Design an enzyme around this catalytic site. Structure first.
Site, PDB file in Angstrom:
ATOM      1  N   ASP A  26     -15.653   1.295   5.208  1.00  0.00           N
ATOM      2  CA  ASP A  26     -15.566   2.672   4.807  1.00  0.00           C
ATOM      3  C   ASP A  26     -14.833   3.508   5.830  1.00  0.00           C
ATOM      4  OD1 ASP A  26     -15.942   4.794   3.008  1.00  0.00           O
ATOM      5  OD2 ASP A  26     -17.858   5.450   3.932  1.00  0.00           O
ATOM      6  N   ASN A  27     -14.288   4.619   5.367  1.00  0.00           N
ATOM      7  CA  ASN A  27     -13.770   5.658   6.265  1.00  0.00           C
ATOM      8  C   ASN A  27     -12.601   5.177   7.131  1.00  0.00           C
ATOM      9  OD1 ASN A  27     -17.162   6.133   6.530  1.00  0.00           O
ATOM     10  ND2 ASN A  27     -15.937   7.703   5.538  1.00  0.00           N
TER      11      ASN A  27
ATOM     12  N   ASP B 190     -20.045   0.697   7.840  1.00  0.00           N
ATOM     13  CA  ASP B 190     -20.152   2.127   7.562  1.00  0.00           C
ATOM     14  C   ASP B 190     -20.977   2.812   8.631  1.00  0.00           C
ATOM     15  OD1 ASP B 190     -19.612   4.494   6.142  1.00  0.00           O
ATOM     16  OD2 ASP B 190     -21.443   4.251   4.876  1.00  0.00           O
TER      17      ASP B 190
ATOM     18  N   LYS C 221     -17.703   4.624  13.837  1.00  0.00           N
ATOM     19  CA  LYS C 221     -16.333   4.146  13.595  1.00  0.00           C
ATOM     20  C   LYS C 221     -15.673   3.376  14.725  1.00  0.00           C
ATOM     21  CE  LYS C 221     -17.471   6.077   9.879  1.00  0.00           C
ATOM     22  NZ  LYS C 221     -18.512   5.240   9.080  1.00  0.00           N
TER      23      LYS C 221
ATOM     24  N   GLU D  95     -16.421  11.184   0.109  1.00  0.00           N
ATOM     25  CA  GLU D  95     -17.607  11.528  -0.628  1.00  0.00           C
ATOM     26  C   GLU D  95     -17.765  13.061  -0.822  1.00  0.00           C
ATOM     27  OE1 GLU D  95     -17.570   9.511   2.294  1.00  0.00           O
ATOM     28  OE2 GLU D  95     -19.253  10.096   3.605  1.00  0.00           O
TER      29      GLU D  95
HETATM   30  C1  LIG Z   1     -23.332   1.836  19.077  1.00  0.00           C
HETATM   31  C2  LIG Z   1     -24.277   1.448  17.915  1.00  0.00           C
HETATM   32  C3  LIG Z   1     -23.431   0.856  16.762  1.00  0.00           C
HETATM   33  N1  LIG Z   1     -24.411   0.005  16.070  1.00  0.00           N
HETATM   34  C4  LIG Z   1     -25.184   0.511  15.047  1.00  0.00           C
HETATM   35  N2  LIG Z   1     -26.154  -0.305  14.611  1.00  0.00           N
HETATM   36  C5  LIG Z   1     -26.987   0.102  13.632  1.00  0.00           C
HETATM   37  N3  LIG Z   1     -26.918   1.299  13.048  1.00  0.00           N
HETATM   38  C6  LIG Z   1     -25.936   2.116  13.505  1.00  0.00           C
HETATM   39  C7  LIG Z   1     -25.050   1.811  14.495  1.00  0.00           C
HETATM   40  N4  LIG Z   1     -24.200   2.852  14.706  1.00  0.00           N
HETATM   41  C8  LIG Z   1     -24.530   3.797  13.860  1.00  0.00           C
HETATM   42  N5  LIG Z   1     -25.641   3.413  13.087  1.00  0.00           N
HETATM   43  C9  LIG Z   1     -26.248   4.158  11.983  1.00  0.00           C
HETATM   44  O1  LIG Z   1     -25.242   4.149  10.933  1.00  0.00           O
HETATM   45  C10 LIG Z   1     -25.121   5.462  10.385  1.00  0.00           C
HETATM   46  C11 LIG Z   1     -23.930   6.117  11.009  1.00  0.00           C
HETATM   47  C12 LIG Z   1     -22.780   6.277  10.336  1.00  0.00           C
HETATM   48  C13 LIG Z   1     -21.585   6.956  10.933  1.00  0.00           C
HETATM   49  N6  LIG Z   1     -20.848   7.535   9.788  1.00  0.00           N
HETATM   50  C14 LIG Z   1     -19.946   8.529   9.954  1.00  0.00           C
HETATM   51  O2  LIG Z   1     -19.795   8.971  11.106  1.00  0.00           O
HETATM   52  C15 LIG Z   1     -19.247   9.060   8.775  1.00  0.00           C
HETATM   53  C16 LIG Z   1     -18.666  10.311   8.935  1.00  0.00           C
HETATM   54  C17 LIG Z   1     -17.985  10.926   7.881  1.00  0.00           C
HETATM   55  C18 LIG Z   1     -17.331  12.218   8.068  1.00  0.00           C
HETATM   56  C19 LIG Z   1     -16.077  12.448   7.414  1.00  0.00           C
HETATM   57  C20 LIG Z   1     -15.400  13.662   7.506  1.00  0.00           C
HETATM   58  C21 LIG Z   1     -16.001  14.655   8.287  1.00  0.00           C
HETATM   59  F1  LIG Z   1     -15.376  15.843   8.413  1.00  0.00           F
HETATM   60  C22 LIG Z   1     -17.223  14.478   8.949  1.00  0.00           C
HETATM   61  C23 LIG Z   1     -17.920  13.245   8.831  1.00  0.00           C
HETATM   62  C24 LIG Z   1     -17.912  10.280   6.605  1.00  0.00           C
HETATM   63  C25 LIG Z   1     -18.529   9.036   6.445  1.00  0.00           C
HETATM   64  O3  LIG Z   1     -18.516   8.390   5.215  1.00  0.00           O
HETATM   65  C26 LIG Z   1     -19.201   8.440   7.519  1.00  0.00           C
HETATM   66  O4  LIG Z   1     -19.750   7.219   7.301  1.00  0.00           O
HETATM   67  C27 LIG Z   1     -26.379   6.215  10.840  1.00  0.00           C
HETATM   68  O5  LIG Z   1     -27.442   5.937   9.916  1.00  0.00           O
HETATM   69  C28 LIG Z   1     -26.573   5.602  12.247  1.00  0.00           C
HETATM   70  O6  LIG Z   1     -27.913   5.662  12.657  1.00  0.00           O
HETATM   71 CL   LIG Z   2     -17.865  11.377  -4.609  1.00  0.00          CL
HETATM   72 MG   LIG Z   3     -18.997   6.382   5.523  1.00  0.00          MG
END
Ligand SMILES: CCCNc1ncnc2c1ncn2[C@@H]1O[C@H](/C=C/CNC(=O)c2cc(-c3ccc(F)cc3)cc(O)c2O)[C@@H](O)[C@H]1O
Ligand SMILES: [Cl-]
Ligand SMILES: [Mg+2]
Length: 213
Positions: free
Chosen positions: A167-168, A139, A142, A197
């Site tokens: 997810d997603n 999650d 992406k 969500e």
């Molecule tokens: C390049 C590093 C990859 N490794 C990684 N290692 C550890 N933590 C990582 C991480 N990448 C991202 N993270 C963390 O995960 C989380 C990021 C999640 C990204 N999630 C989304 O982009 C997302 C986005 C949407 C979304 C859906 C529709 C929309 F119109 C706009 C947004 C819905 C979701 O349910 C989502 O999960 C943050 O806390 C970030 O700090």
């Molecule tokens: Cl919900």
């Molecule tokens: Mg998500």
């Protein structure tokens, strides 16, 4: 002040301490009547709950903690002795997740790992005493679902029957990840159509069970 801090504060003020379910409810309520946030949410969370109950994983890895909503959701359903590891690269969010888990009374079932998955995954065996994972929840960013899945394989952290739950896979979408787990003989896949969500946009989770190489 940040949105994530406001969500925490709302939980701290309104939820019942040591009650994980009330924590989920308060986060959902905030996001339903105030600011949207990217928690897995209640609809997709029911599917998550179902998978956790069915497979009873002793060790779960979560990629991307954010505010800790999914950490609370999985952890609360783990059997006694079962553990969750959650990787979070943003130290502000890791700090929020820890406070969320503390509030929920789940701190002893969950370990937050600080850093990026691509750097933590290869340390799991030596630094965190992991043999194999029973479940992984994806999650985070992406475009990293596919690379991290390959890295988990390469590192020998998946065993036959290890459940990946992503997810997603529709919105925002993980087309590359799907092409891989659905095309590969190494996974048997099941798609779970639900909703994004806090709204009625169609999204889904993919369940991909590792078969061995
Ligand atoms: C390049 C590093 C990859 N490794 C990684 N290692 C550890 N933590 C990582 C991480 N990448 C991202 N993270 C963390 O995960 C989380 C990021 C999640 C990204 N999630 C989304 O982009 C997302 C986005 C949407 C979304 C859906 C529709 C929309 F119109 C706009 C947004 C819905 C979701 O349910 C989502 O999960 C943050 O806390 C970030 O700090
Ligand atoms: Cl919900
Ligand atoms: Mg998500």
């Amino acid at each position: 002040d940040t949105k994530e801090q406001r969500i925490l504060r709302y939980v701290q003020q309104n939820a019942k301490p040591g009650d994980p379910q009330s924590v989920l409810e308060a986060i959902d309520t905030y996001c339903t009547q105030k600011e949207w946030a990217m928690n897995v949410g209640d609809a997709k969370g029911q599917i998550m709950d179902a998978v956790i109950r069915e497979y009873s994983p002793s060790l779960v890895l979560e990629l991307g903690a954010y505010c800790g909503y999914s950490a609370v959701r999985m952890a609360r359903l783990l059997q006694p002795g079962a553990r969750l590891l959650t990787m979070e690269m943003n130290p502000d969010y890791a700090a929020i997740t820890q406070q969320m888990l503390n509030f929920a009374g789940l701190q002893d079932k969950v370990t937050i790992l600080n850093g990026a998955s691509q750097d933590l995954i290869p340390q799991l065996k030596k630094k965190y005493d992991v043999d194999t994972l029973d479940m992984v929840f994806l999650d985070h960013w992406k475009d990293r679902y596919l690379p991290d899945t390959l890295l988990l394989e390469k590192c020998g952290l998946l065993r036959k029957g290890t459940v990946l739950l992503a997810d997603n896979v529709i919105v925002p979408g993980t087309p590359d990840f799907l092409a891989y787990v659905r095309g590969s003989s190494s996974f048997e896949c099941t798609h779970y159509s639900s909703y994004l969500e806090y709204m009625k946009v169609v999204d889904g989770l993919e369940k991909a069970i590792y078969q061995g190489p």
